[PDB]
């Protein structure tokens, strides 16, 4: 409802397909090329196009509408931008997998070290699971020390003894034992070299290795074009009002851009194979850090403050991360927290709500013939008087703030409209105590507005909450629809939780003074 209309049909997701991003697709979806490292045009507003703050990416300020989609803060989801890397670089997360893939295939012919002739692999291919099949294939291929030139009818092999490779941090060392004994001429497997190797792999080995032609194509495990997230993903913090600081991602992206430009400038002049090496390793380092900043056995990139950087992996992991910080759990609206107090004169499922909270929280209500008069009375009562309403919502979603509407007498409700009345008697409202060990730790009560500023409970229902009136606090979550009210009333009503499925016994009972009195 609150969303503006769209002609596109609305549906619900059903399947999420993973996979890597092909460079050509990256280019296709990007709307601009990011080349200039300095974010700001001339320190006089209108940041420079071609830089990290390109307005086509998406507007982040209210008064500017996105040059690409034409929407404001409401809808503009941020529009990617690509960036071309001069030199192919490893993708940090896929180093061990790339190592295993290289082991399983040839260095020159670029095919599996073995054919289907071997019965072990002949069976291994049949395994439907890509991951287990890959595990078996690696077990059966890492043994072969040499890529044979002849079928174990030439197999098309290279004949070169397949090198033994041992990972070293950000770099890969391949060890060859050349023809009885020779000097081991190991060397650093360059990302571009392996990329060119992978480009020649046929679909047969691809699928045999558990990969996919359309979605997971192995050479895509090496970075060539780095997409650039819009400003939304990396918004500009405001240390104090006017002065806005650069999010760590902004610094990291600008640094990678500078380094990439720098590599592009070595080839045109004296590049004595040692400036090239260190500089490209530096570029690899910033790329890896911007992708993850917790690599074992290596020092950690830092800001000039000395604090370690905020890599995306760090963002996602941890309790504070997205999954456990804003996806499963999230701070919600229409709640309240306060102190509790016993009150023997409340029925079991009732609950005392301080009047101020009742006046503050609100539950939308639709306008009908059965309530038109009552709702109109509420509206006349104003938001500062209880009972009374706070907002009126039109059929099209237009809101009315009754605080600033001096002309409330000039309002006549229309059927189908929605009124956010105060939290009135008999309403069903959830009620929780943290921690919520077991499902009895949170039930739905019936509201009964009372003065003073504490929630009130029937002394019996503490038992399930394991709560005492010595300063404990409990939360109150209000529904915001009619169905939700139905579920709360029918599934989470306190009376329906009297018997606990844990031990098929009653959970609440007579406690404290009532018990010692009845005895």
């Amino acid at each position: 409802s609150q969303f503006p209309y769209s002609s596109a049909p609305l549906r619900s997701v059903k399947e999420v397909q993973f996979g890597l991003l092909s460079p050509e697709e990256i280019r296709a979806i990007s709307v601009v090329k990011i080349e200039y490292p300095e974010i700001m045009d001339e320190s006089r507003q209108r940041p420079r196009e071609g830089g990290l703050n390109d307005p086509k990416l998406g507007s982040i300020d209210r008064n500017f509408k996105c040059q690409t989609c034409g929407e404001g803060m409401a809808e503009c989801p941020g529009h990617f931008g690509h960036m071309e890397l001069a030199k192919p670089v490893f993708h940090i997360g896929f180093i061990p997998k790339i190592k295993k893939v290289c082991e399983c295939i040839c260095m020159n012919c670029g095919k599996l070290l073995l054919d289907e002739t071997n019965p072990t692999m002949a069976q291994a291919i049949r395994i439907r699971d890509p991951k287990k099949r890959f595990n078996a294939v690696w077990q059966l291929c890492k043994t072969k020390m040499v890529c044979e030139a002849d079928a174990p009818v030439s197999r098309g092999g290279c004949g070169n003894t397949q090198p033994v490779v041992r990972k070293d941090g950000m770099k890969l060392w391949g060890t060859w034992k050349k023809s009885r004994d020779a000097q081991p001429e190991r060397k650093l497997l360059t990302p571009g070299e392996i990329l060119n190797v992978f480009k020649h792999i046929s679909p047969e080995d691809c699928f045999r290795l558990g990969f996919n032609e359309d979605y997971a194509r192995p050479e895509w495990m090496i970075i060539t074009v780095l997409p650039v997230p819009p400003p939304q993903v990396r918004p500009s913090i405001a240390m104090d009002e006017t002065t806005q600081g650069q999010d760590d991602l902004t610094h990291k992206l600008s640094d990678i851009l500078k380094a990439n430009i720098n590599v592009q400038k070595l080839e045109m002049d004296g590049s004595p194979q040692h400036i090239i090496n260190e500089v490209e390793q530096l570029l690899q380092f910033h790329v890896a850090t911007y992708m993850d900043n917790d690599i074992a056995g290596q020092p950690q990139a830092l800001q000039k403050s000395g604090r370690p950087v905020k890599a995306i992996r760090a963002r996602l992991k941890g309790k504070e991360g997205r999954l456990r910080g804003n996806l499963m759990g999230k701070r919600v609206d229409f709640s309240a927290r306060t102190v509790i107090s016993g009150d023997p004169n409340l029925e079991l499922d009732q609950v005392g709500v301080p009047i101020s909270i009742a006046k503050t929280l609100s539950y939308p209500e639709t306008v009908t013939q059965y309530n038109i008069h009552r709702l109109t009375e509420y509206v006349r009562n104003g938001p500062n008087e209880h009972p009374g309403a706070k907002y009126v919502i039109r059929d099209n979603g237009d809101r009315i703030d009754l605080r600033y509407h001096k002309r409330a007498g000039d309002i006549v409700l229309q059927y189908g409209w929605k009124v956010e009345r105060h939290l009135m008697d008999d309403d069903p409202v959830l009620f929780n105590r943290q921690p919520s060990l077991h499902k009895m730790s949170m039930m739905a009560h019936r509201v009964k507005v009372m003065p003073y500023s504490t929630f009130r409970l029937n002394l019996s229902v503490t038992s399930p909450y394991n709560a005492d009136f010595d300063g404990d606090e409990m939360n109150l979550h209000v529904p915001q629809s009619e169905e939700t009210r139905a579920e709360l009333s029918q599934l989470c009503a306190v009376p329906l939780q009297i018997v606990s499925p844990q031990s098929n016994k009653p959970v609440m009972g007579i406690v404290q003074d009532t018990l010692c009195g009845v005895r």
Binding site: L437, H438, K439, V499, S500, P501, Q502, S503, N504
Partner: protein
């Protein structure tokens, strides 16, 4: 298929007790009147005596009870414990029946034995848990309610009904109806996220707490430690 909030600790009558006691309590006799149903409590006492079809029906019932006793005492509860959670109180249902119809006094019942046996047996075949006609479905249905049916037979025995309870016809019929309804009300509901419920019910007690026992033992079990302490 029983929801965790619809069971109670009841005693299965047939499990404990000596062979002599079981015989004396459940076994009917028509040839020896010293071991036959008391006449006053039944209006048709004279009719029953010296009959055979009644005798064969009641021998079948007693055989079913003996089979139940042997089955439970050998297979299910070897130690002999006879108190186990099960759905539907029977004591409470019976005493509700008694109060409702004022079954006090020594009024002779008007309830024929074949009525009793046929009603009980029919009830045993109506406690639906799975509704399907597949051979496998029927076998599973029979397997599921086996213990509960054993209990029902242990309770609604002819001697017990006609002496200790003295139900009339209406009371017995209402009891059967109530048993059916209560059982059908005591099943798990499709969609119940029983997994989370089990998780919470198992975790919560641990919070309230030469071999090692307690939290360390539970932690060892959960991780499947190969070499426990």
């Amino acid at each position: 298929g029983l929801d965790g909030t619809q069971v109670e600790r009841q005693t299965i009558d047939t499990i404990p007790g000596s062979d002599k006691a079981f015989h004396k309590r459940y076994y009917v006799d028509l040839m020896d009147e010293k071991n036959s149903i008391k006449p006053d409590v039944i209006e048709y006492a004279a009719d029953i005596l010296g009959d055979v079809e009644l005798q064969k029906e009641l021998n079948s019932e007693y055989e079913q009870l003996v089979s139940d006793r042997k089955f439970l005492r050998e297979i299910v509860f070897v130690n002999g414990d006879h108190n186990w959670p099960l759905p539907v109180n029977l004591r409470r249902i019976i005493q509700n029946a008694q109060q409702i119809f004022h079954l006090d006094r020594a009024k002779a019942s008007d309830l024929t034995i074949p009525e009793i046996i046929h009603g009980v047996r029919d009830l045993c075949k109506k406690l639906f848990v799975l509704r399907g006609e597949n051979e496998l479905i029927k076998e599973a249905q029979q397997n599921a309610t086996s213990l509960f049916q054993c209990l029902v037979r242990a309770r609604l025995a002819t001697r017990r009904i006609l002496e200790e309870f003295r139900l009339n016809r209406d009371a017995f019929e209402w009891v059967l109806g109530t048993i059916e309804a209560q059982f059908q009300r005591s099943l798990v509901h499709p969609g119940e996220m029983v997994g989370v419920i089990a998780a919470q019910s198992i975790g919560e007690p641990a919070t309230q707490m030469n071999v090692t026992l307690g939290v360390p033992r539970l932690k060892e079990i959960l991780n499947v430690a190969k070499n426990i302490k």
